[PDB]
């Protein structure tokens, strides 16, 4: 959630967080393109976890 990100993690620690869970969005789309993706909830929730690191970064 957001209050685990907010006020506990800094600029770089949320900055290093996006590029770590952009690989999660990348590798899940590499698995979706093949047949090797069973659980499809991971693809939608990695979108909405990038959006809240980018949300708590705009409000720093």
């Amino acid at each position: 959630k957001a209050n685990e990100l907010r006020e506990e993690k800094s600029g770089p620690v949320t900055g290093n967080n996006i590029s770590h869970l952009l690989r999660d969005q990348f590798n899940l789309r590499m698995q979706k393109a093949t047949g090797q993706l069973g659980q499809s909830h991971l693809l939608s929730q990695v979108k909405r976890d990038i959006a809240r690191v980018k949300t708590v970064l705009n409000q720093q």
């Binding site: 590029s19 952009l22 990348f26 590499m30």
Partner: protein
Amino acid sequence: MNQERVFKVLLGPHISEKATGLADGKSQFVFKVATDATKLEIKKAVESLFSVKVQRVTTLNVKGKTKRTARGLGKRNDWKKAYIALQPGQDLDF
């Protein structure tokens, strides 16, 4: 390269009989890439995300197909298609 956008460039290995047999015989791998991606972006992304060395990248724009239904004509997303040619002696693994 703006350390994002390496992950936004490659959209998956494209799976066809042409893509499979041209990955076996030659060392060319067919990737669907993002529809606004230059040949330099989809070369530095493969060299970064796969630790491989890229020799050549050719590209395609593909038009979406229009499928007639009731309620009229629909259309699919126009997509993009890159052929990643590597040095002989290495293949991409996922």
